[PDB]
């Protein structure tokens, strides 16, 4: 058989289904989302870290020039100094009295500890769900992973399950994402080569061990003043450090819908943001004929102390008469009330208690015990506990959320207004008939 039904994307909160073939016993179907994974396609632009800005020993020539040669090192800066007099300890370091050339060199390099404290820049294009479904039917379980796209049938070894397209596409990550030590940020990092000093992305490379490092650190070489040797350089601060100091909060603390952000691979796990239409091809071996199931002759339900809440705050007792002992399921036919137990055991002339969770002030819903439908109808009280630790199992509907007393007063006022309108038009028509004759 083929059955298509829509499930919320909530981790936990099993979803009730009663598949009902024409000549077969009704069969229970629990559809539970045990896991979810929004895993997007990420490619990396570069990696950045705090730089090292190593300055080598300056080159000196005495009564001779040192026009510097261009090099391929990161943020190379070679600059020539005239009228210098080098002086280390032990005396003046060369012969030439005043016409000396000093080639000062300054390039930049990764710090030795960049293999740990590094930020990797990625693009995020689109993300597709990969949900784990626990589906149980006819006392048979099946845990299987499916892609929520409408075509992939998942792990269809025995049970063929297609998760149709979800109603809304969330994608918590923006286009450009920075990952640093397991923390994920939506930062608008610069492109490869469009580098800005004093900001994030000032130094870029394709890999930590890569050799083609590019940087714009705004390094400036100054003419030396003291007699001793040194290379005076003024440089903008590390944009990695500035971004660390002004990172804001990562997406593990600000992602909507409660999406737990995890890394290697980048993904968002265990969050609900829509509805999945799942179509299931249940095999015919799971079903049984209606003659093998114990039919019900008389059955009546009475609810006791209904409290509408996220927890199972219901207790209904069904009194039944059955032909023969056997186990055969039970279901709640309203979207407002969902049962707790799916399959019950029915023997003869007895009573079974069941728990339900509802979101309506009135419990007025149909319970199918093993094929027979009954209307359970009474009033539910608001809870005394204000805050609960489990999510709501049923979404609220406008028709259900208004009680019988409130609807009675509303239609009482509306019917009074409409009845005065009708009798006014009636007496107007009577007056028109009297004056027309």
């Amino acid at each position: 058989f083929e059955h298509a039904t829509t499930v919320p994307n909530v981790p936990g909160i099993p979803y009730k289904a009663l598949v009902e073939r024409a000549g077969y016993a009704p069969l229970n179907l629990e559809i539970t989302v045990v896991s979810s994974e929004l895993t997007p396609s990420t490619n990396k632009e570069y990696v950045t870290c705090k730089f090292h800005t190593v300055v080598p020993s300056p080159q000196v020539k005495c009564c001779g020039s040192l026009e510097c040669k261009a090099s391929s090192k990161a943020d190379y800066t070679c600059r020539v100094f005239g009228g210098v007099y080098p002086f280390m300890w032990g005396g003046a370091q060369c012969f030439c009295d005043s016409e000396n050339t000093q080639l000062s060199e300054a390039y930049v390099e990764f710090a030795p500890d960049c293999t740990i404290d590094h930020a990797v820049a990625l693009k995020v294009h689109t993300a597709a769900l990969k949900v784990g479904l626990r589906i149980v039917y006819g006392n048979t379980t099946a845990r299987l992973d499916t892609f929520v796209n409408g075509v992939t049938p998942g792990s269809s070894r025995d049970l063929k399950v297609i998760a149709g397209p979800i109603s809304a596409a969330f994608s918590p990550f923006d286009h450009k994402v920075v990952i640093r030590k397991g923390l994920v940020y939506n930062y608008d990092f610069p492109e490869y080569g469009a580098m800005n000093p004093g900001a994030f992305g000032d130094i870029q490379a394709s890999s930590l061990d890569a050799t083609d490092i590019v940087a714009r650190t705004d390094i400036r070489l100054l003419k030396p003043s003291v007699k001793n040797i040194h290379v005076p350089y003024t440089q903008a601060v590390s944009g990695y450090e500035m971004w660390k100091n002004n990172s804001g909060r990562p997406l593990q603390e600000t992602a909507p819908f409660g999406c737990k952000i995890e890394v290697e691979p980048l993904r968002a796990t265990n969050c609900a943001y829509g509805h999945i239409p799942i179509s299931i091809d249940i095999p015919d071996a799971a079903f049984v004929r209606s003659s093998e199931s114990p039919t019900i002759l008389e059955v009546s339900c009475t609810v006791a102390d209904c409290i509408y809440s996220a927890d199972f705050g219901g207790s209904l007792t069904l009194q039944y008469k059955a032909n023969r002992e056997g186990h055969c399921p039970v279901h709640s036919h309203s979207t407002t009330a969902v049962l707790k137990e799916a399959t019950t055991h029915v023997t003869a002339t007895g009573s079974i208690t069941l728990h339900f969770s509802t979101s309506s002030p009135q419990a007025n819903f149909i319970v199918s015990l093993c094929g027979k439908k009954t209307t359970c109808n009474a009033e539910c009280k608001p809870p005394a506990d204000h805050i609960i630790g489990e999510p709501h199992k049923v979404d609220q509907e406008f028709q259900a959320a208004v009680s019988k007393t409130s609807w009675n007063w509303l239609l009482a006022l509306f019917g009074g207004a409409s009845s005065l309108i009708v009798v006014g038009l009636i007496v107007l028509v009577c007056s028109s008939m009297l004056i027309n004759t």
Partner: protein, 101 residues
Amino acid sequence: ATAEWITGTTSRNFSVGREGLEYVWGNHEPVRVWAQESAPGDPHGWPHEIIIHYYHRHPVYTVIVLCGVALAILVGTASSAACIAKARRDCLTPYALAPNA
């Protein structure tokens, strides 16, 4: 998302809805709480209790429903009285043009 560095002893208020609220306090694991509708009233009772219960649940929906039903009853009574007045006019007009009738 609200992040705050707290020292000493204080009290922090957080509005929890039906969608829920997840809070992390220090190195502890996150705690998730869901607000369930527990308005101070009774949906099965006198109209004022129902009104205050639904107003505490949804204020704008309750006030627009109350305004709508008030407008409905005012229009119904006003138009019904207008029809009664028009019928009285059309009935008593022939007898008002003759004192001797």
